[PDB]
């Protein structure tokens, strides 16, 4: 795998409040010379995942894109729900990291590798920003480095 992806560690943010949530850490490692950051550490909610398949399916390859697990009827907290929601956003990732043309979507490489919110990825996709992609990477790689993943 010429880059490593996992999606891991789900966690119930503000549990039990009226704007409670669930999020992923996705973790990613790679020589590839399409990222900025050799390695990195983010988490995202389902919600953000569905917004950045959007993203991928305007590509100029019109390459198909990963399905991603389905929405809920409900607020999904269990243990089962969230495993499996997990298994599919990792199978998700490790598809559209095997595809050269969705390595150009710079929104993904935002998603990936920072934590903008989405509008803020949208405004510095779009020019509204005082900053490029490979600049906010490279700060939040500066910023968000913990010492986590010892090299190979
Ligand atoms: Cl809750
Ligand atoms: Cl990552
Ligand atoms: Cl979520
Ligand atoms: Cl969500
Ligand atoms: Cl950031
Ligand atoms: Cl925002
Ligand atoms: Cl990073
Ligand atoms: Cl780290």
Redo the contacts with the bound molecule.
């Keep these: 795998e010429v880059i490593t992806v996992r999606v891991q560690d789900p966690r119930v943010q503000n549990e039990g409040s009226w704007n409670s949530?669930?999020?992923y850490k996705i973790f990613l490692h790679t020589n590839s010379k399409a990222f900025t950051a050799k390695t990195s550490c983010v988490r995202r909610?389902?919600?953000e995942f569905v917004w950045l398949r959007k993203q991928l399916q305007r590509n100029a390859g019109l390459v198909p894109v990963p399905e991603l697990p389905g929405k809920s009827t409900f607020f999904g907290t269990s243990d089962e729900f969230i495993e499996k929601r997990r298994q599919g956003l990792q199978h998700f990732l490790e598809k559209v990291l095997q595809s050269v043309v969705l390595l150009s979507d710079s929104q993904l490489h935002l998603f990936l590798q920072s934590q903008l919110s989405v509008p803020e990825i949208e405004a510095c996709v779009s020019g509204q920003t005082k900053y490029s992609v490979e600049e906010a990477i490279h700060k939040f790689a500066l910023m968000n480095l913990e010492h986590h993943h010892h090299h190979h």
């Design positions: 949530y669930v999020d909610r389902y919600r």
